[PDB]
Design an enzyme around this catalytic site. Structure first.
Site, short mmCIF file in Angstrom:
data_model
loop_
_atom_site.label_atom_id
_atom_site.label_comp_id
_atom_site.label_asym_id
_atom_site.label_seq_id
_atom_site.Cartn_x
_atom_site.Cartn_y
_atom_site.Cartn_z
N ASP B 25 0.53 -1.15 0.03
CA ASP B 25 -0.07 -0.10 -0.09
C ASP B 25 0.73 1.19 0.08
O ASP B 25 1.24 1.66 1.02
CB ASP B 25 -0.95 -0.03 1.16
N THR B 26 1.01 1.84 -1.18
CA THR B 26 1.76 2.94 -1.19
C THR B 26 1.04 4.29 -0.57
O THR B 26 1.75 5.33 -0.31
CB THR B 26 2.03 3.55 -2.96
N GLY B 27 -0.21 4.18 -0.20
CA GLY B 27 -0.94 5.29 0.53
C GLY B 27 -0.80 5.20 1.86
O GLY B 27 -1.65 6.12 2.41
C1 LIG Z 1 -12.17 -0.95 -0.47
N1 LIG Z 1 -11.71 0.35 -0.12
C2 LIG Z 1 -10.35 0.96 -0.63
O1 LIG Z 1 -9.99 0.23 -1.50
C3 LIG Z 1 -10.05 2.01 0.17
N2 LIG Z 1 -8.51 1.81 0.54
C4 LIG Z 1 -7.77 2.30 1.50
O2 LIG Z 1 -8.29 2.67 2.67
C5 LIG Z 1 -6.35 1.81 1.69
O3 LIG Z 1 -6.05 0.90 2.94
C6 LIG Z 1 -6.24 -0.45 2.51
C7 LIG Z 1 -7.65 -1.03 2.55
C8 LIG Z 1 -8.09 -1.69 1.91
C9 LIG Z 1 -9.53 -2.07 1.65
C10 LIG Z 1 -10.25 -1.68 2.99
C11 LIG Z 1 -11.86 -2.35 2.98
C12 LIG Z 1 -12.83 -1.48 3.58
C13 LIG Z 1 -14.21 -2.05 3.73
C14 LIG Z 1 -14.48 -3.25 3.51
N3 LIG Z 1 -13.31 -4.08 2.67
C15 LIG Z 1 -12.31 -3.49 2.60
C16 LIG Z 1 -9.67 -0.99 4.07
C17 LIG Z 1 -8.36 -0.51 3.92
C18 LIG Z 1 -5.68 3.25 1.52
O4 LIG Z 1 -4.38 3.19 1.01
C19 LIG Z 1 -5.05 3.43 2.97
O5 LIG Z 1 -4.02 2.92 3.63
C20 LIG Z 1 -4.61 4.89 3.07
O6 LIG Z 1 -5.73 5.82 2.38
C21 LIG Z 1 -5.24 7.01 2.04
C22 LIG Z 1 -5.26 8.34 3.10
C23 LIG Z 1 -3.80 8.72 3.20
C24 LIG Z 1 -3.73 9.71 4.14
C25 LIG Z 1 -4.54 10.18 5.01
C26 LIG Z 1 -4.71 11.05 6.02
C27 LIG Z 1 -5.26 11.21 7.33
C28 LIG Z 1 -5.33 12.28 8.28
C29 LIG Z 1 -4.20 13.13 7.81
N4 LIG Z 1 -3.30 13.18 6.81
C30 LIG Z 1 -3.89 12.27 5.89
C31 LIG Z 1 -6.26 9.55 4.77
C32 LIG Z 1 -6.02 8.46 3.74
C33 LIG Z 1 -4.78 5.15 4.72
O7 LIG Z 1 -5.69 5.34 5.37
N5 LIG Z 1 -3.42 5.49 5.08
C34 LIG Z 1 -3.06 5.93 6.60
C35 LIG Z 1 -2.15 7.03 6.55
O8 LIG Z 1 -0.92 7.07 5.70
N6 LIG Z 1 -2.50 8.11 7.15
C36 LIG Z 1 -1.76 9.31 7.44
C37 LIG Z 1 -2.28 4.53 7.30
C38 LIG Z 1 -1.81 4.97 8.75
C39 LIG Z 1 -3.06 3.38 7.14
C40 LIG Z 1 -10.32 3.46 -0.77
C41 LIG Z 1 -11.86 3.73 -0.97
C42 LIG Z 1 -9.59 4.72 -0.20
#
Ligand SMILES: CNC(=O)[C@@H](NC(=O)[C@H](OCc1ccc(-c2cccnc2)cc1)[C@H](O)[C@@H](O)[C@@H](OCc1ccc(-c2cccnc2)cc1)C(=O)N[C@H](C(=O)NC)C(C)C)C(C)C
Lengths: 99, 99
Positions: B25-27
């Site tokens: 996960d690059t995000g």
């Molecule tokens: C099906 N759903 C997806 O495919 C969803 N995928 C994800 O959430 C990925 O996660 C895997 C994932 C995959 C499937 C399900 C899923 C759900 C339901 C059902 N089935 C599967 C749940 C999780 C992301 O890349 C995630 O990692 C990353 O999101 C981007 C991001 C970056 C910075 C801030 C951000 C926040 C606050 C401040 N600054 C930036 C806020 C958001 C994120 O939240 N990054 C965080 C981060 O870097 N924060 C800084 C880290 C700590 C995890 C998408 C619709 C967005």
């Protein structure tokens, strides 16, 4: 180009004539952008990620430019804290993960 | 190897002697794994995702093998829908985005 991951992979994108900053996210199935106005009809949808689900508006066949590369696809608009470029568009510009 | 994004970039990881599948996960700044037991003391951390923030347990210097590549770093354990391999570890295995 080759983008390292020492820092968040942010790139400039062009959509609806507006320039915005977005994250290349291989972990996102979809593309989600901050609240903005887009042309055409939309459908409500719920998408989940870390922290739960958020309600977004779904727009299909939207044109977006990612680092010069044009791509067409579905774009979701909602209360996302950061603009996310998901796999649905990453594939269109031929982006791959390598190691 | 070279991984395309037409499907989720799921790989097999080995941690605590067990095999689990995770998402490159690059995000994600950090690596977050579903609830499990790990050795040592842990520290608290609050991380934000698309749907809000969640509380997780932070473990340091944890050995984890990703596709045959051994890495040792910080791992977070919490209520995550899927195991996530973030940038902290992707950099350790020399992963880059290309197009
Ligand atoms: C099906 N759903 C997806 O495919 C969803 N995928 C994800 O959430 C990925 O996660 C895997 C994932 C995959 C499937 C399900 C899923 C759900 C339901 C059902 N089935 C599967 C749940 C999780 C992301 O890349 C995630 O990692 C990353 O999101 C981007 C991001 C970056 C910075 C801030 C951000 C926040 C606050 C401040 N600054 C930036 C806020 C958001 C994120 O939240 N990054 C965080 C981060 O870097 N924060 C800084 C880290 C700590 C995890 C998408 C619709 C967005």
């Amino acid at each position: 180009p080759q983008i390292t991951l020492w820092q968040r992979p942010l790139v400039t994108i062009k959509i609806g004539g507006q320039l915005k900053e977005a994250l290349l996210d291989t972990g996102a199935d979809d593309t989600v952008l901050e609240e903005m106005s887009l042309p055409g009809r939309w459908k409500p949808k719920m998408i989940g990620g870390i922290g739960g689900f958020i309600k977004v508006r779904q727009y299909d066949q939207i044109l977006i430019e990612i680092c010069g590369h044009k791509a067409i696809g579905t774009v979701l608009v909602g209360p996302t804290p950061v603009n996310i470029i998901g796999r649905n568009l990453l594939t269109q510009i031929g982006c791959t993960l390598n190691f």
